[PDB]
Amino acid sequence: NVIAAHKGVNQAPVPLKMERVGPHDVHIEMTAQITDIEIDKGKIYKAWTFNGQAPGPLVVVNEGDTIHFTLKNMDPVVPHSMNFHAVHASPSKDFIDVMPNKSGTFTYPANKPGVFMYHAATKPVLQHIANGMHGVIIVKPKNGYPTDKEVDREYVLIQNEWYKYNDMNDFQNGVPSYVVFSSKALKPGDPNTNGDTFTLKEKPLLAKVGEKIRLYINNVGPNEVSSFHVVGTVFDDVYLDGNPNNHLQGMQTVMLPASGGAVVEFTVTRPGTYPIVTHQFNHAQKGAVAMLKVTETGED
Amino acid sequence: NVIAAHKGVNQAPVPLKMERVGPHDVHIEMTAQITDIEIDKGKIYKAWTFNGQAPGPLVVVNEGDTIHFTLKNMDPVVPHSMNFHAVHASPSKDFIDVMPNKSGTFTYPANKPGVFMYHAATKPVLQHIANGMHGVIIVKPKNGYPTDKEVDREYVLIQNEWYKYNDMNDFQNGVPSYVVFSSKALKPGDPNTNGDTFTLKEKPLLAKVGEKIRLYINNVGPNEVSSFHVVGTVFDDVYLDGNPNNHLQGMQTVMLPASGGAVVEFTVTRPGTYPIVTHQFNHAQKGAVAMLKVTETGED
Amino acid sequence: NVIAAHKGVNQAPVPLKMERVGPHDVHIEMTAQITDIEIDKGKIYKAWTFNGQAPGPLVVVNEGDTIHFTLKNMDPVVPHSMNFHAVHASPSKDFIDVMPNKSGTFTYPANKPGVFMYHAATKPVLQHIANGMHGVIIVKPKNGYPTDKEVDREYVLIQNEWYKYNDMNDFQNGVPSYVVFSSKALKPGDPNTNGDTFTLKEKPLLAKVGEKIRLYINNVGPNEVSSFHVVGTVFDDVYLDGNPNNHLQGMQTVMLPASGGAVVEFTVTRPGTYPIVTHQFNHAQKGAVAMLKVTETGED
Ligand SMILES: O=N[O-]
Ligand SMILES: O=N[O-]
Ligand SMILES: O=N[O-]
Ligand SMILES: [Cu+2]
Ligand SMILES: [Cu+2]
Ligand SMILES: [Cu+2]
Ligand SMILES: [Cu+2]
Ligand SMILES: [Cu+2]
Ligand SMILES: [Cu+2]
Ligand SMILES: [Cu+2]
Ligand SMILES: [Cu+2]
Ligand SMILES: [Cu+2]
Ligand SMILES: [Cu+2]
Ligand SMILES: [Cu+2]
Ligand SMILES: [Cu+2]
Ligand SMILES: [Cu+2]
Ligand SMILES: [Cu+2]
Ligand SMILES: [Cu+2]
Ligand SMILES: [Cu+2]
Ligand SMILES: [Cu+2]
Ligand SMILES: [Cu+2]
């Protein structure tokens, strides 16, 4: 199922570009590009990506920022596009296709705090998402969260599925071959990984005994819901979609729809390694287990 | 899988009958009937229906109304019945079968505000729901919703699946062949459609730039959950099951169980066409995309 | 797929042992054992169990109790282990394997009120859960629930799936063969059953006309979410995961993730038999229907 013009194509990752251009305005430039990603050991997926990552690079803006977004399409033959769930926009004017070897710029406001999916909007959308064109944009709430002062350390996790390569029958009708977590960096030194079955097991996220950890999470799908759970703890506080008003306490497991987000916070009380799962254990068995290593110092 | 006595049967739609009979009492009369519905282009499903619609006709009552419900069974051979999720009733006395060519009347109160599924209760219930015997009853809250004064325009949407015709193995064990939206009229001039893959794409719901839209939504299944999302906006306010107390804000996507309802409200800020999806994109690809056309005047 | 050392093995159920050892400390002793369970009429599953029950025996503790848990592994060849979702623990030190014919003791606090899953933690966790090593621990809130004084009668229900026997391909990739409810006793005289397709239909839970019923519920999976609904009523109050803060009202149906819990309360207004379902009707058809028989006296 490899398009003739994609045979042998493996475009090197290109860094995300972002710069603030006013107190409430931010420029973002991404690419659409075709990049080989190792999704399981020995298994390469020639993914349709933003910037050579799948999920794509993390975007963080402030509530009330208007985003001036440019997509540079490096794919030699397939059009691509961008839909941010954070924004208010006209889909038929602002989420439109950018043709091969062209760029397009679109402007829209991020009025709402939270942890939002982004993805390509090009028909068939299922094909673009399943092939890798998904990601997260975080919109920071103007007044924070009521538990901000309690949080010691924070990371971003994203859940996605992988199917048989570019196979629309499988995408529509088949079980996922792999379900995976990735982490995207918020601060210098944080890991930045792609959706694969192994990296966050072999290179766990790090924390220190006694810390309260915040995770910004989103299940991008394309197709499955997620039963998000951290082994050995309970979520002290949960904010559905990352909106501070949607505040639950003491949850064992957080139900995420496809594209669903949350801010979750939990305390790690003892040294050890703590798995992070979707509790739909067929999906966990097919890759969706990450690890958090908790040490007396927070160092590995 | 077509029952001998249903071969060639296509009973014309019969209008819902409703009339208020007291300040807190309402008569409703439906039929059970066998009616051909075009669920995808060129694909007829000889559905088991209420009133020749699938999902069935919309019912709207007020909180505290007692419903005096009559079902007239026009099916020549299969018994049918009615279960309203809105009501408090004895299932074994009030949700019982009405035999072919007979009628039955049942009385029960709708004590709780919200957006409730209704469906046939006849064993096997899966068979009756999958073949088309589902619908929505809205119970209006005595004191409204706190955001009532902000809403400019409102519609009803229902999600359902379609399987291989009357195939209990497929109903139990197979993926849906189609997943679809329909709209049911609240006010004169609103569309009133059946669950199909195309009508709400070709004849979009209409709105005006700047409006706040309310949707009353229910995912009737039979089998899937729904990740309900409007492209190009964020839900300002969500009331789970349509109960005013269950109030979320700023949600990108609303997780609906099978039979789950909600009242969702969102603002459309720019002219254009806005898709409405379940974000489980396998289901969207198999039909579950509706459209909302937003114009400077609200006219098409 | 029957391990040689399990052929012909059917270890008799062993009672749960629990005793309070201080105002905030409780001893619990379970077994891991291999026991034949009739999951559907004529269908024996040689389950991997705690104490010869699947789901395992109910555990009830108070918020703030530290649990001193001993597992005695009676399996001749497979290691087993215990993970309580209620507790804060080091998974790599406290949820570790107990080898055949050995015991292990682990101590950890239950700081959070609610209705929590427990299950084996031994890799592959999917295999242990699917084969029967799941259950519920209830942690009673120090200050109760705000609706405690309204509740007349209470029971515990658990939902689980069963797959082809010890078949990891089916566990990962196949639909469940059966989906089932069981009830676990809270007070003397309550039923105590295993996850099967028939017992709670033939021997319904009992209640009296006019009562408000509380159910403590958990969907242990392993793989499916649950759309929990009681026919003929509406949930007056719902507490997600059994935490009193997570308070919804007037829900028709409660969405439970895999491992998700709730406390749900509803009123039965008329004599009759009331089905209890997951509204994902493929699962209901494959076993997941229990019954509640409501009489003028509450006696059968
Ligand atoms: O909490 N691990 O299923
Ligand atoms: O927001 N369309 O996936
Ligand atoms: O309420 N029985 O689907
Ligand atoms: Cu300013
Ligand atoms: Cu600019
Ligand atoms: Cu694309
Ligand atoms: Cu989207
Ligand atoms: Cu701290
Ligand atoms: Cu915790
Ligand atoms: Cu009155
Ligand atoms: Cu009457
Ligand atoms: Cu019917
Ligand atoms: Cu129902
Ligand atoms: Cu307005
Ligand atoms: Cu919006
Ligand atoms: Cu004390
Ligand atoms: Cu002790
Ligand atoms: Cu085990
Ligand atoms: Cu678990
Ligand atoms: Cu009472
Ligand atoms: Cu009720």
PDB file of C-alpha atoms in Angstrom, chain A residues 175-177 225-229 231-237 247-256 266-275 279-283 285-286, chain C residues 83 85-95 107-109 112 115-117 119 124-126 129 168 171-173 218 222-223 225 240-241 243 245-246 255 257-259 261:
ATOM      1  CA  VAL A 175      -8.439  -4.109  15.462  1.00  0.00           C
ATOM      2  CA  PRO A 176      -5.312  -1.988  16.023  1.00  0.00           C
ATOM      3  CA  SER A 177      -2.025  -3.802  15.570  1.00  0.00           C
ATOM      4  CA  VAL A 225     -11.367   5.155  23.680  1.00  0.00           C
ATOM      5  CA  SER A 226      -8.852   5.019  26.562  1.00  0.00           C
ATOM      6  CA  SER A 227      -9.145   3.915  30.204  1.00  0.00           C
ATOM      7  CA  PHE A 228      -6.181   5.862  31.565  1.00  0.00           C
ATOM      8  CA  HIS A 229      -4.633   4.553  34.819  1.00  0.00           C
ATOM      9  CA  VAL A 231      -0.470   1.751  38.730  1.00  0.00           C
ATOM     10  CA  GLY A 232       0.180   2.175  42.456  1.00  0.00           C
ATOM     11  CA  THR A 233      -1.592   5.520  42.872  1.00  0.00           C
ATOM     12  CA  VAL A 234      -5.003   7.195  42.581  1.00  0.00           C
ATOM     13  CA  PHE A 235      -5.605  10.485  40.763  1.00  0.00           C
ATOM     14  CA  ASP A 236      -5.922  13.152  43.441  1.00  0.00           C
ATOM     15  CA  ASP A 237      -7.431  15.625  40.948  1.00  0.00           C
ATOM     16  CA  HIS A 247     -12.855  18.978  38.365  1.00  0.00           C
ATOM     17  CA  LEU A 248     -13.049  15.354  39.627  1.00  0.00           C
ATOM     18  CA  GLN A 249     -11.234  13.908  42.646  1.00  0.00           C
ATOM     19  CA  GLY A 250      -9.961  10.505  43.684  1.00  0.00           C
ATOM     20  CA  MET A 251     -10.400   8.724  40.341  1.00  0.00           C
ATOM     21  CA  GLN A 252      -8.723   5.359  39.785  1.00  0.00           C
ATOM     22  CA  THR A 253      -9.093   5.553  35.992  1.00  0.00           C
ATOM     23  CA  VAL A 254     -10.039   8.352  33.566  1.00  0.00           C
ATOM     24  CA  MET A 255     -12.325   7.544  30.600  1.00  0.00           C
ATOM     25  CA  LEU A 256     -11.096   9.445  27.500  1.00  0.00           C
ATOM     26  CA  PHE A 266      -1.277  11.946  41.484  1.00  0.00           C
ATOM     27  CA  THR A 267       1.214  11.333  44.277  1.00  0.00           C
ATOM     28  CA  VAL A 268       3.987   8.707  44.159  1.00  0.00           C
ATOM     29  CA  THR A 269       4.671   7.668  47.742  1.00  0.00           C
ATOM     30  CA  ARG A 270       7.413   5.014  47.463  1.00  0.00           C
ATOM     31  CA  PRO A 271      10.511   4.321  45.359  1.00  0.00           C
ATOM     32  CA  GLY A 272      10.003   1.984  42.433  1.00  0.00           C
ATOM     33  CA  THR A 273       8.788   1.723  38.865  1.00  0.00           C
ATOM     34  CA  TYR A 274       5.136   2.584  38.223  1.00  0.00           C
ATOM     35  CA  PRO A 275       3.436   1.423  34.996  1.00  0.00           C
ATOM     36  CA  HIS A 279      -6.750  -0.407  31.313  1.00  0.00           C
ATOM     37  CA  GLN A 280      -8.340  -1.839  28.172  1.00  0.00           C
ATOM     38  CA  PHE A 281      -5.764  -4.568  28.558  1.00  0.00           C
ATOM     39  CA  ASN A 282      -5.855  -5.809  24.970  1.00  0.00           C
ATOM     40  CA  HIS A 283      -4.451  -2.390  24.042  1.00  0.00           C
ATOM     41  CA  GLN A 285      -0.728  -5.860  25.706  1.00  0.00           C
ATOM     42  CA  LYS A 286      -0.340  -4.414  22.175  1.00  0.00           C
TER      43      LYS A 286
ATOM     44  CA  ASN C  83      -2.619  -5.038  42.614  1.00  0.00           C
ATOM     45  CA  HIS C  85      -6.402   0.087  42.728  1.00  0.00           C
ATOM     46  CA  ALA C  86      -7.378   1.451  46.163  1.00  0.00           C
ATOM     47  CA  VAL C  87      -3.820   1.707  47.471  1.00  0.00           C
ATOM     48  CA  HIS C  88      -0.704   3.835  47.201  1.00  0.00           C
ATOM     49  CA  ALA C  89       2.175   1.399  46.729  1.00  0.00           C
ATOM     50  CA  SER C  90       5.451   0.798  44.892  1.00  0.00           C
ATOM     51  CA  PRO C  91       4.365  -1.550  42.078  1.00  0.00           C
ATOM     52  CA  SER C  92       7.858  -3.028  41.643  1.00  0.00           C
ATOM     53  CA  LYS C  93       8.193  -3.777  45.392  1.00  0.00           C
ATOM     54  CA  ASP C  94       4.623  -4.322  46.626  1.00  0.00           C
ATOM     55  CA  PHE C  95       2.728  -5.876  43.663  1.00  0.00           C
ATOM     56  CA  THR C 107       1.466  -3.614  53.287  1.00  0.00           C
ATOM     57  CA  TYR C 108      -0.048  -0.426  51.856  1.00  0.00           C
ATOM     58  CA  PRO C 109      -2.621   2.280  52.712  1.00  0.00           C
ATOM     59  CA  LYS C 112      -9.188   7.234  49.076  1.00  0.00           C
ATOM     60  CA  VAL C 115     -15.189   1.269  44.431  1.00  0.00           C
ATOM     61  CA  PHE C 116     -11.844  -0.014  43.173  1.00  0.00           C
ATOM     62  CA  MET C 117     -10.736  -2.867  40.978  1.00  0.00           C
ATOM     63  CA  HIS C 119      -6.392  -7.886  39.949  1.00  0.00           C
ATOM     64  CA  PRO C 124       1.158 -10.681  30.951  1.00  0.00           C
ATOM     65  CA  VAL C 125      -1.462  -8.895  33.033  1.00  0.00           C
ATOM     66  CA  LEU C 126      -4.050  -9.346  30.259  1.00  0.00           C
ATOM     67  CA  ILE C 129      -7.217 -10.753  34.220  1.00  0.00           C
ATOM     68  CA  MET C 168      -3.783 -14.810  24.160  1.00  0.00           C
ATOM     69  CA  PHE C 171      -7.670 -11.994  24.481  1.00  0.00           C
ATOM     70  CA  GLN C 172      -5.837  -9.342  22.391  1.00  0.00           C
ATOM     71  CA  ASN C 173      -7.756  -9.416  19.107  1.00  0.00           C
ATOM     72  CA  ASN C 218     -17.187  -1.880  38.809  1.00  0.00           C
ATOM     73  CA  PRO C 222     -10.406  -6.827  30.826  1.00  0.00           C
ATOM     74  CA  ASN C 223     -11.060  -5.019  27.552  1.00  0.00           C
ATOM     75  CA  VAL C 225     -16.094  -0.271  28.554  1.00  0.00           C
ATOM     76  CA  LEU C 240     -17.952   8.383  39.923  1.00  0.00           C
ATOM     77  CA  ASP C 241     -15.438   5.849  41.264  1.00  0.00           C
ATOM     78  CA  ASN C 243     -15.734   9.300  45.515  1.00  0.00           C
ATOM     79  CA  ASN C 245     -17.153  14.598  45.354  1.00  0.00           C
ATOM     80  CA  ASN C 246     -17.832  13.232  41.847  1.00  0.00           C
ATOM     81  CA  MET C 255     -20.195   5.250  31.241  1.00  0.00           C
ATOM     82  CA  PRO C 257     -14.013   2.708  31.607  1.00  0.00           C
ATOM     83  CA  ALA C 258     -12.283  -0.632  31.964  1.00  0.00           C
ATOM     84  CA  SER C 259     -11.602  -0.805  35.761  1.00  0.00           C
ATOM     85  CA  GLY C 261     -16.317   2.094  39.355  1.00  0.00           C
TER      86      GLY C 261
END
